[PDB]
Design a protein around this ligand. Structure first.
Ligand code: PT5
Ligand code: PT5
Ligand code: Y01
Ligand code: Y01
Ligand code: CLR
Ligand code: CLR
Lengths: 781, 781
């Protein structure tokens, strides 16, 4: 006929006596894709587990179903009618004596019980998990003194009917299994109930039962279910490694089974990085996919979910801004400071969030840019060249290069930048955070020596070290608290997401308590003014501030433009690639050509006002994306979490940028933060961003004996001595890059990264196997 | 007949082609109580795992063995003869055409291969694991193109014979299984080989095959094996909680099976704490069990294993001695100091290790004794009583109470001291380590305030804190390194066992480097002299040093004697109970009556010379025992470690005591250790000993949601509220005890600690059920 299959919610009800000896059915276990048992002593629900059967119970079940009486497509609609029909058929099939007809019927008309039978508070919580269109089944297994032989009955109702006071949740029933036998047999009826329920909770078996017509089809379905099972021999499980191989073996077995099924069935039977050719094609394609959703981009942020992010993202886009800028003040003779960096961050962020194609990106100063800033400053103050005027021409060339790269569709080279260079560029970012911290500490200890009885203050070095260590430890332990197993589980996440503000506030109050001790503090000027209003204006003359600019450097400034373009391009395209994956349920569209052009043009224009260039960070962009995802609730117990949807809007980023811009009118309060707390946070970010990259783990695996290596796909398919050779080559390249960065040619490491782009292909294909590269240099997993 | 069963070492050899296309057998997996597989791509052995089967392969195996030809008790002794007989029987049973008799015969005399076929270095390393009296079996499965139907043969040799160049290790073979079939069938021969090998490596199946005589018994044994198995349904393993329930279910299933077997079999069929009554009976009983082994006790320590302990146990019995000895000097006006404590430790340790019944005990000053010392000092300097004379009479009463308690057999009350009071006592010991550290820190910060520009030194208050934190962190992280997964695994343990010496040495060097900063240092006097040689002699006059002693106190000193006897008795008896368990394979014997009498008598006599009393520590004794256990090497791969034996001797303890005694002639070197380094170790010992006691874990569970609780036996059998009530009732008693310890009646907390023994027997039984007490207050597990 039609018999459209539905998902099944299976319940086990067992007959038992009460304290007043009145017999009644009590619920014992429930199946929603996984078994859940009721503990007898404490009367609560245990954790979900895989439903492991036993073989003797399966044999007994097959024998019982072979000798039982089955009713198919019954026309009854009430419990008494179903019970009467069942007892009549049991009488017909010579299973129960007619004299007991009056007795056994009374056993099928008893009240049902449940652990929770206040009720709605858990009834709704269980109804959320169950799929919307699910049809339930009831298994009634128990022993009766007045019977002599076991009797079984399988009933499939013609139409779903809601039997009240039978199940645990209001779901219609479709199937009924009744078993009633004597108590002197060797069979365990709880085991038979568990076996039949685990059979019915399966996918293929329950579909077959939906489409079945007699007992032979039930036997065939039982054989089909048994074909793809795993038998575990009777041996003690001593260690823990013994049961880590079941998943892979089950995967292979079910793969073979599904391949056989697919063969039998066969016998029975918009890339965003593709270049078209039209000039500026990518720009038009990206605009005409994202702009029409403009109204929805604003209407979609009216919920508290989109208000709790702005509170702490503001604290993540601000801490580096006041840190990095300070460093520039120490490195460029206070030509570029915290005020200019904050103004540039705000001004570029608001425009990008109003006109960008991917509003979920937050842009700001990053690690590998201040190194280039310092290198260019060192080069400028060697040949008697003004530092701040050359940046104007660098930006002028950068704006032209961006247009050249966008006009001819060329933002597809990010496909050639594989994991080999991404993991090196992650170590560079995570090592210009630790080095600056451990250099500032040494400088502090040198300026204020530790002799006995401004410069030479008594208790300044050790106090700064203590503040740094305290801030780092607080920020680390709150991060570890975020993913722990304490507290109600939603306050846990909220507290764990405020690690940085809490750490900074605590370690600022501690230093505010201490009096009569000098600790260096932030330098934020009053009002809207340039950090050095004695040698620098707001607009830079493109011809020369103090002396006329040379004409040769006007054209010879092509090389630094190319290097900084390489840096910006890598840092932005990698982030856009990471954000717009398929695992993250990002609807609408992503912009690969409207982000590069906008960022580089804004940087080039902004460098005229003596403000730094910016590039989208790849760590706080992921944090911004994560803070906006909402997970589903219709997930079966014990199943892995599933992302429902990500709220895409351009209102949280705009508000965060505006807040960071307005954070300059509270300078009187921002001048009370000591300069060691910020470096504690600096070191914390540097250390904590290492987790995730495979280069770090393969570097760990150097010190581990080959017996203790994990079972990941890049360690169990390649020999140990080739994994170590790959790691050694990567380390050698990283060390060479650091050496060339630390010498007098510091403004050449972008060229070294571009030269490690094709080393991979040419050399590491001429050496390694075509099969080992897919294991070690894989882009997925 | 006889057919005595042995353990079985199963190997799987599969036919395959070489690069030169020459056919040969290659080893694929091996079974010693657990499966171990050879990876095809990398050619190395994977980790052990439980041998999970598949059902279709089992059905194919049953059908193949049903139609195969079996040879029982063959008289051949060489491979060619066995092959000839096998081919003849295959021809007899109409399985192989006679025309192919030659061809298949060749396939039975091909060279065998192995992963390691340098060979001896791993041959011995694997021969260690295999049991000495084990007999092996060889499984040969592969495909051939010249056959049309599968043929099988099972051969059991009459006597074990060493077949060279067949197995991987030189072990005699007893069984042979040969299977050869066409390559166009749907059967997978690797799976059949795995199935038959996992059958033959079982504990009951191989015995059944030993006693078997025909094919029907093989089928019966197959059914027996299948009876006690677990079937896992075809569902994906999504999470990780799914497979944590297999162990318990397997335990229950095997328990039922073994109960059935035992029922069928039935149908077919020196306490050391027992009082006798004779006076001093226990003393004689433990003397006559331990003294005769004197020569063995002295002859059993001639190995490097008994020499690496003395190196670091000396560093564990010394750090508290110079710490506690300092504190008493600050608390008793330098009447008892480091020198007196060190000398008492040495003098009592040597005598105890020379005459004791349990030499594996290290005695020394512990936490709850200095609290009583301080309380008695505070009581003495209130009524104008000399402090050092009263201890003489306290010892005089103690040496009488010990004799009274030993003469009438009374060292059996330790059975009534349950876990309820043991955990409270462990918290008391672990909370007098943190408190003293965090009080010394506050005192240091108060004496040297943090103002700007002996008392009032500039950089002392922060330097001491830095040193404490550094020492604690180093000592903690080396402890965590001891049980990590780095380094060759035997250097790892050696480095992890030297945490305290390394942590102290590094920071001593660091503070040595710093110049022109004052940090308070240890006060160890030169030569053999008392700590204060201006107000105290070496022999205390029992009548009064400065003024005559009152006569009323001479008799009234009974109460402190009891209040300190309780502490000594608990601390010694708990340690002796913990040490002499059954899990620790301690041979010879333990003395419950020769340790109490000796320790208390030595404490009473040693208090006449103005030296403190001592009681065995329950943490350093366990460390001493652990440092002397030697583990076995004959353990199958993947199995849990097993203790071979423990070297019991009275030479390492005597040497450690002598070293601690001689550590006073290096005072010029011990006076360079800053006093803030030792308190790091103090706090580390306080924090690190909380792990293990169930009170701490049940205190953690107050914050966990009921969803995240573990699966231990005391959380899944009692309701959550009736667990938190028990935890709160324990915390209330602990808080009351800590309150009575801090007021002006501080020398009464032993009475409170002994008043919680009848509380458990009277009150906590009238509230909690008889079944909840066995779950929460269990002595085992
Ligand atoms: C500014 C700093 C302030 C610090 C001052 C102190 C601050 C407090 C400091 C230290 C002590 C703190 C916390 C101790 C904790 C109690 C909660 C821990 C036990 C607990 O968890 O109980 C809770 C709540 O039940 C109560 O009513 C519990 C009733 C709590 C009693 C009231 C406590 C309120 C605070 C007491 C002190 C009040 C002090 C206020 C005075 C102010 C002084 C200034 C039961 O939770 P549940 O089982 O019903 O819900 C579960 C649970 O949330 C799971 O975690 C969750 O799974 P995950 O999301 O994966 O984690 C489940 O979700 P699914 O099943 O769908 O997957 C939920 O279904
Ligand atoms: C700089 C970074 C700072 C932070 C980094 C962290 C720390 C500071 C950094 C670096 C310092 C250290 C390097 C030390 C490490 C090497 C990695 C160890 C890998 C390794 O394990 O390889 C070893 C030996 O292989 C060699 O022959 C290896 C032979 C060549 C090794 C080098 C030779 C000289 C080493 C010293 C170098 C000298 C350097 C200084 C001297 C220069 C002076 C100017 C293979 O060991 P195995 O597989 O044969 O034996 C296993 C293994 O021991 C398992 O652990 C054990 O199981 P468990 O007991 O349960 O753990 C098995 O027992 P069962 O079968 O009964 O279960 C054994 O069967
Ligand atoms: C920068 C260093 C100090 C850090 C890490 C060094 C090791 C992880 C590397 C350095 C040299 C490497 C070896 C150098 C070359 C080879 C050849 C390599 O090629 C082969 O397969 C040998 C046979 C052939 O050439 O085909 C096998 C691994 C091995 C021994 C390497 C193993 C790993 C080693 C010891
Ligand atoms: C300040 C902190 C560190 C101390 C610990 C406090 C809580 C862990 C304790 C204090 C009071 C306890 C409650 C006191 C009384 C009861 C009644 C008790 O009632 C029953 O035993 C049920 C049977 C019946 O109702 O007769 C169940 C536990 C409960 C809720 C206890 C739960 C745990 C509480 C809240
Ligand atoms: C400290 C680190 C970063 C650099 C020093 C690396 C040297 C000292 C260590 C690190 C990794 C080590 C290797 C780790 C694993 C093996 C496999 C083993 O079967 C032979 C030795 C061998 C090949 C080790 C040789 C020594 C080795 C190369
Ligand atoms: C500082 C800490 C140790 C003190 C916190 C103690 C109080 C607030 C905590 C300790 C244990 C907690 C209990 C833990 C588990 C449950 C089970 C839940 O179904 C109802 C609430 C209840 C009963 C909690 C109530 C709050 C509780 C009693």
């Amino acid at each position: 006929l039609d018999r459209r299959p539905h998902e099944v919610f299976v319940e086990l009800n067992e007959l038992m006596l009460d304290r007043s000896q009145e017999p009644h059915w009590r619920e014992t276990a429930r199946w929603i894709k996984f078994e859940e048992d009721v503990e007898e002593e404490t009367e609560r629900w245990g954790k979900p587990h895989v439903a492991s059967l036993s073989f003797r119970s399966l044999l007994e079940l097959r024998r019982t179903i072979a000798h039982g009486a089955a009713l198919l497509d019954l026309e009854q609609t009430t419990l008494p009618g179903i019970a009467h029909l069942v007892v009549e058929t049991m009488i017909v099939s010579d299973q129960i004596r007619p004299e007991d007809r009056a007795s056994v019927l009374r056993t099928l008309l008893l009240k049902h019980s449940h652990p929770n039978d206040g009720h709605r508070g858990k009834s709704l919580k269980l109804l959320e998990k169950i799929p919307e269109d699910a049809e339930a089944t009831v298994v009634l297994v128990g022993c009766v003194p007045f019977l002599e032989q076991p009797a079984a009955a399988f009933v499939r109702l013609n139409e779903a009917v809601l039997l009240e006071s039978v199940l645990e949740v209001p779901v219609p029933v479709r199937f009924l299994f009744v078993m009633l036998g004597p108590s002197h047999t060797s069979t365990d009826y709880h085991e038979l109930g568990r076996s039949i329920a685990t059979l019915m909770s399966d996918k293929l078996f329950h579909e077959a039962a939906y489409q079945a017509d007699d007992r032979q089809d039930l036997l065939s379905a039982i054989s089909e279910f048994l074909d793809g099972s795993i038998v575990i021999p009777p041996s003690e499980v001593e260690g823990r490694d013994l049961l880590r191989s079941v998943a892979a073996f089950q995967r292979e077995l079910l793969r073979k089974r599904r391949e056989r099924e697919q063969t039998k069935v066969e016998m029975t039977t918009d890339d965003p990085l593709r270049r078209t050719g039209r000039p500026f094609g990518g720009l038009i394609r990206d605009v005409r996919r994202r702009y029409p959703h403009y109204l929805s981009d604003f209407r979609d942020a009216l919920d508290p979910q989109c208000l709790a992010a702005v509170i702490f993202i503001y604290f993540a886009a601000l801490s580096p801004a006041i840190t990095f800028g300070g460093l520039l003040g120490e490195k460029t003779q206070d030509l570029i400071g915290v005020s200019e960096l904050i103004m540039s961050t705000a001004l570029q962020g608001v425009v990008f969030c109003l006109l960008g194609a991917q509003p979920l990106l937050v842009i700001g100063f990053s690690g590998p840019l201040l190194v280039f800033e310092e290198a260019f400053f060192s080069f400028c103050s060697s040949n008697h060249l003004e530092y701040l005027v050359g940046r104007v021409w660098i930006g002028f060339w950068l704006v032209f290069l961006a247009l050249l790269m966008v006009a001819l569709e060329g933002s597809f080279l990010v496909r050639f930048v594989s994991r080999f260079t991404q993991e090196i560029f992650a170590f560079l970012i995570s090592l210009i955070f630790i080095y600056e911290t451990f250099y500032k500490l040494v400088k502090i200890f040198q300026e204020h020596p530790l002799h006995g009885c401004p410069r030479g203050q008594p208790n300044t070095a050790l106090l700064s070290l203590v503040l740094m260590a305290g801030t780092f430890f607080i920020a680390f332990f709150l991060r570890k608290f975020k993913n722990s197993r304490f507290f109600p589980g939603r306050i846990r996440r909220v507290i764990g997401d405020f690690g940085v503000p809490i750490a900074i506030l605590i370690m600022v109050l501690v230093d505010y308590s201490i009096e009569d001790t000098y600790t260096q503090k932030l330098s934020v000027p009053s009002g809207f003014s340039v950090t050095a209003p004695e040698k620098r204006g707001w607009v830079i003359n493109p011809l020369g501030e103090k002396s006329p600019f040379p004409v040769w450097m006007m054209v010879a400034s092509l090389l630094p433009a190319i290097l900084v373009f390489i840096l910006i391009f890598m840092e932005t395209q990698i982030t856009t690639l990471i954000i717009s994956k398929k695992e993250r349920m990002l609807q609408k569209g992503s912009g690969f050509h409207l982000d590069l052009l906008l960022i580089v043009a804004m940087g080039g224009i902004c460098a005229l006002f003596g403000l730094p260039w910016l590039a989208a960070a790849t760590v706080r962009s992921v944090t911004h994306a994560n803070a906006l995802t909402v997970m589903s609730k219709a997930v079966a117990p014990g199943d892995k979490p599933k992302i429902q949807e990500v709220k895409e809007q351009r209102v949280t980023g705009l508000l965060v940028a505006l807040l960071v811009g307005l954070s300059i009118v509270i300078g009187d309060l921002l001048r009370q933060i000591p300069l060691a707390v910020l470096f504690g946070i600096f070191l914390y970010m540097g250390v904590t961003s290492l987790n995730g990259i495979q280069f770090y783990e393969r570097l760990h695996l150097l010190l581990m004996p080959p017996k203790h290596h994990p079972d990941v796909t890049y360690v169990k398919k390649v020999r140990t001595l080739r994994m170590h050779l790959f790691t050694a080559l990567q380390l050698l390249c990283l060390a060479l890059l650091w050496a060339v960065m630390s010498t007098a040619a510091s403004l050449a490491f972008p060229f070294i990264l571009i030269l490690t782009v094709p080393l991979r292909m040419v050399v590491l294909t001429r050496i390694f196997t075509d099969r080992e590269m897919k294991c070690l240099d894989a882009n997925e997993a």
